[PDB]
Amino acid sequence: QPLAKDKVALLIGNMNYREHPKLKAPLVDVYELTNLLRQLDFKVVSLLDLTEYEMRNAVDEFLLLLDKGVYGLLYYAGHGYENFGNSFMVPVDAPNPYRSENCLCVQNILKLMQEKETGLNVFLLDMCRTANIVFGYATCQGGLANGIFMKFLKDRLLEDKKITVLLDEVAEDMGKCHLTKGKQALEIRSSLSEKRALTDPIQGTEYSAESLVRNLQWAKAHELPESMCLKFDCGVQIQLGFAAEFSNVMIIYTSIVYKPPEIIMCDAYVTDFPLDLDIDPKDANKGTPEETGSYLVSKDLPKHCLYTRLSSLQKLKEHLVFTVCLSYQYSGLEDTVEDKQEVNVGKPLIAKLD
Amino acid sequence: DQPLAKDKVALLIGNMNYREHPKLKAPLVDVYELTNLLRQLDFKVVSLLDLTEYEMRNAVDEFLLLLDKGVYGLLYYAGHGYENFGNSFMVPVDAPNPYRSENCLCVQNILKLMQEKETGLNVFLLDMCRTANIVFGYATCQGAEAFEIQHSGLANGIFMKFLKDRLLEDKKITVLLDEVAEDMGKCHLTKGKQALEIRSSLSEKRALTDPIQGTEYSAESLVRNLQWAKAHELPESMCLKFDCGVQIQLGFAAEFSNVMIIYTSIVYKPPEIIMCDAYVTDFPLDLDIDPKDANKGTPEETGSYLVSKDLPKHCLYTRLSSLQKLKEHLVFTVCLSYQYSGLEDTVEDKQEVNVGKPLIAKL
Numbered sequence: 001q002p003l004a005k006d007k008v009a010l011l012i013g014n015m016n017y018r019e020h021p022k023l024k025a026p027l028v029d030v031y032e033l034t035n036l037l038r039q040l041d042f043k044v045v046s047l048l049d050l051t052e053y054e055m056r057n058a059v060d061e062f063l064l065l066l067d068k069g070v071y072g073l074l075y076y077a078g079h080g081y082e083n084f085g086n087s088f089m090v091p092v093d094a095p096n097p098y099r100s101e102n103c104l105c106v107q108n109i110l111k112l113m114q115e116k117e118t119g120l121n122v123f124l125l126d127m128c129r130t131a132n133i134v135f136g137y138a139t140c141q142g143g144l145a146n147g148i149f150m151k152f153l154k155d156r157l158l159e160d161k162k163i164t165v166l167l168d169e170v171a172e173d174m175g176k177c178h179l180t181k182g183k184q185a186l187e188i189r190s191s192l193s194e195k196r197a198l199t200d201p202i203q204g205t206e207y208s209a210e211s212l213v214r215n216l217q218w219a220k221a222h223e224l225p226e227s228m229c230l231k232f233d234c235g236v237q238i239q240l241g242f243a244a245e246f247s248n249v250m251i252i253y254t255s256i257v258y259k260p261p262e263i264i265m266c267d268a269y270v271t272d273f274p275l276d277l278d279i280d281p282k283d284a285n286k287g288t289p290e291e292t293g294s295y296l297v298s299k300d301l302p303k304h305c306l307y308t309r310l311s312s313l314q315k316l317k318e319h320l321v322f323t324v325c326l327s328y329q330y331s332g333l334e335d336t337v338e339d340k341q342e343v344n345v346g347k348p349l350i351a352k353l354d
Numbered sequence: 355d356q357p358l359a360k361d362k363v364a365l366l367i368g369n370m371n372y373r374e375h376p377k378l379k380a381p382l383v384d385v386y387e388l389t390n391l392l393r394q395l396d397f398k399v400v401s402l403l404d405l406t407e408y409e410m411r412n413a414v415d416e417f418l419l420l421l422d423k424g425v426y427g428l429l430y431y432a433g434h435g436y437e438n439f440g441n442s443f444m445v446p447v448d449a450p451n452p453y454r455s456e457n458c459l460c461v462q463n464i465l466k467l468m469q470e471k472e473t474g475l476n477v478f479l480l481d482m483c484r485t486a487n488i489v490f491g492y493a494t495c496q497g498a499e500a501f502e503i504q505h506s507g508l509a510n511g512i513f514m515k516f517l518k519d520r521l522l523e524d525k526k527i528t529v530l531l532d533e534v535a536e537d538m539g540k541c542h543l544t545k546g547k548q549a550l551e552i553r554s555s556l557s558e559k560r561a562l563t564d565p566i567q568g569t570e571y572s573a574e575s576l577v578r579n580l581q582w583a584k585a586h587e588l589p590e591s592m593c594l595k596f597d598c599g600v601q602i603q604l605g606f607a608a609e610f611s612n613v614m615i616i617y618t619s620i621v622y623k624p625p626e627i628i629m630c631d632a633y634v635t636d637f638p639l640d641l642d643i644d645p646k647d648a649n650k651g652t653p654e655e656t657g658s659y660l661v662s663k664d665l666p667k668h669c670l671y672t673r674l675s676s677l678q679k680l681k682e683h684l685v686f687t688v689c690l691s692y693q694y695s696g697l698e699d700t701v702e703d704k705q706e707v708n709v710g711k712p713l714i715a716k717l
């Protein structure tokens with residue numbers, strides 16, 4: 001029975017390009033793929049909208065996890081560039097027109113992967129135009145629907161079959177669909193000489209330094225701040241919540257859980273976020289998570305709160321410090337009272353790394 | 355439902371006799387055996403040994419013109435190869451030492467031309483020594499180290515030994531090749547001697563065993579049949595009669611599309627004649643036939659080990675390789691040295707023969 005020493009996955013979805021058309025599918029697809037891989041016991045890091053420097057750092061750190069026998073999976077969705085026989089992943093800060101030096105060369109990553117003694121290394125490119133390496137290269141021409149590749153991949157990914165056979169079925173499913181024939185293509189390259197599957201069990205978990213390094217890094221990237229009850233001088237109590245949508249996207253939500261009898265009406269809101277997050281106050285404190293651009297973790301969030309989506313957590317170099325304001329009017333009075341409390345929740349999710 | 359092929363054509367090239375590089379042995383057996391397995395799957399096959407740059411570019415370009423809509427193509431190359439700047443190359447027998455890209459055939463350039471075809475299935479197999487529905491098998495093996503114990507020259511190469519055991523399966527070509535890759539992985543002898551990468555954009559259930567689409571007489575179909583029929587035309591057997599009464603039969607067999615075996619035998623000898631030798635000579639200079647290799651008592655003495663079994667026995671054999679170099683009619687002389695009963699004098703006679711342009715030279 002083939003076994004994995006560990007299962008690690010890096011998933012990058014680029015959508016909000018500074019000088020190129022915006023994509024919608026990577027958001028839904030990276031989130032879908034993250035939960036499918038968690039079902040197969042992968043430790044996953046999922047990141048949205050990365051610059052060149054961020055993507056190069058993420059890919060280099062992912063490659064350091066590929067110790068002998070480890071199963072790796074690198075998925076990229078976004079703009080892709082093809083030039084002089086090479087393909088390139090396009091970061092969100094790419095100039096117009098594309099230049100090689102600003103993008104990540106796919107063949108350079110494949111060359112770095114061939115140097116590893118991984119039990120399985122899957123590299124999937126879902127682009128808009130022995131190492132045991134399986135490379136899938138999906139290409140399509142330029143609301144919450146999946147992209148073509150993920151629509152077919154998600155319905156086969158949990159199969160207990162050799163990864164090459166399973167990807168071959170995905171390519172055949174696409175060729176049997178009229179939507180794909182003149183819109184989407186799939187190319188698979190493989191030097192897999194053994195029976196290896198994403199479903200293969202992880203080997204009897206020892207506590208070696210090598211395995212502890214891999215678990216530590218992943219554990220940091222998943223650290224959410226604990227829920228907080230803020231107590232104000234006037235008696236008002238605000239509950240503060242934190243949810244992870246991606247490794248670099250966190251949803252914050254607030255609710256006035258206790259309002260004293262003597263206070264007619266009160267409003268709470270979050271403000272003064274670190275400037276490196278670039279939070280537009282007009283997109284914060286929404287009555288629904290969907291209004292923040294958060295449509296995936298929405299269902300699993302408490303109701304009747306105010307929501308703020310904190311994306312770009314990878315850009316935070318300091319502690320996440322922000323303010324909770326309170327505007328309350330006393331009974332039988334004509335004054336609006338303001339009071340604020342600073343909150344330091346440390347370095348959440350991917351910002352926990354350094 | 356059952357996928358169909360409009361037609362099935364294959365071009366197999368095996369380079370062994372390098373001018374400035376080491377000689378290989380496995381392409382001879384591998385190209386011969388793969389030809390016979392493909393014929394069993396109803397492919398029209400062209401098999402060529404030892405091609406120069408010019409010959410290879412012509413063979414590949416002419417095979418690419420056969421790839422009409424719905425056609426199943428297979429290109430197989432065995433010989434020296436090299437990878438330079440992400441591109442791989444097929445080395446022709448006239449390539450200088452060291453390799454120069456302009457003298458070699460770029461594999462990526464060929465794959466690009468295949469992409470422009472509406473083929474039902476396009477299979478490109480490289481067995482090198484170091485929409486289109488394309489399936490590309492890139493096999494690379496370690497060049498034989500100087501002190502390694504060599505085995506028989508009639509042994510299969512590593513890739514073909516594994517491929518021949520799966521090739522006839524009625525299974526999707528990508529799955530079949532994936533099983534070949536896995537068979538090589540289980541064999542620990544191949545761990546550092548043979549590698550195999552499979553690249554595929556096949557989007558349908560295509561197999562080499564798919565039946566050919568209800569055989570027609572269209573112009574486009576007849577064009578592929580005609581070119582292939584020309585490359586398989588052998589001269590018919592001849593009976594040469596000499597003044598002395600002796601009759602000599604001259605026979606012809608094909609080993610490869612560019613290798614023909616000629617054989618002579620005495621079919622009638624008058625009782626008054628005792629000694630009687632027939633031998634072939636005056637071959638076109640372009641073929642470069644060494645007379646020391648001609649007129650042998652066994653096919654194996656000419657370097658012919660594959661069609662030997664199907665050749666008539668008790669003949670004199672001559673192997674004519676490099677038929678692709680023949681630029682005019684294959685004209686040669688059949689000599690007769692004989693002796694009458696009771697006489698010490700050896701009498702001589704000869705007859706010139708024109709057998710047209712055989713096999714690949716018929717193009």
Ligand SMILES: CO[C@@H](C)c1c(Nc2ccc([C@H](N(C)C(=O)C3CCS(=O)(=O)CC3)C(F)(F)F)cc2)cnc2cc(Cl)nn12
Pocket residue numbers: 007008009010043044045047050053054055057058059061062065217218221248314315316317350353354
């Ligand atoms: C080994 O670590 C774990 C968590 C890890 C990865 N590491 C990783 C991911 C993203 C980044 C980038 N970061 C923070 C910067 O580039 C920073 C560098 C320091 S800085 O001050 O410039 C802030 C930006 C990005 F993409 F988020 F931006 C860097 C490292 C990658 N894949 C996996 C898969 C699994 Cl499982 N674990 N894993």
Ligand SMILES: CO[C@@H](C)c1c(Nc2ccc([C@H](N(C)C(=O)C3CCS(=O)(=O)CC3)C(F)(F)F)cc2)cnc2cc(Cl)nn12
Pocket residue numbers: 362363364365398399400402405408409410412413414416417420581582585612678679680681714715717
């Ligand atoms: C469409 O035709 C058929 C027979 C055909 C091919 N054609 C083909 C064409 C040229 C050559 C070369 N030739 C003669 C020259 O290069 C000559 C060029 C003119 S010349 O006078 O210089 C002598 C050499 C070589 F390789 F033999 F050398 C070899 C093969 C190729 N693949 C297939 C597969 C199937 Cl099925 N049919 N098929």
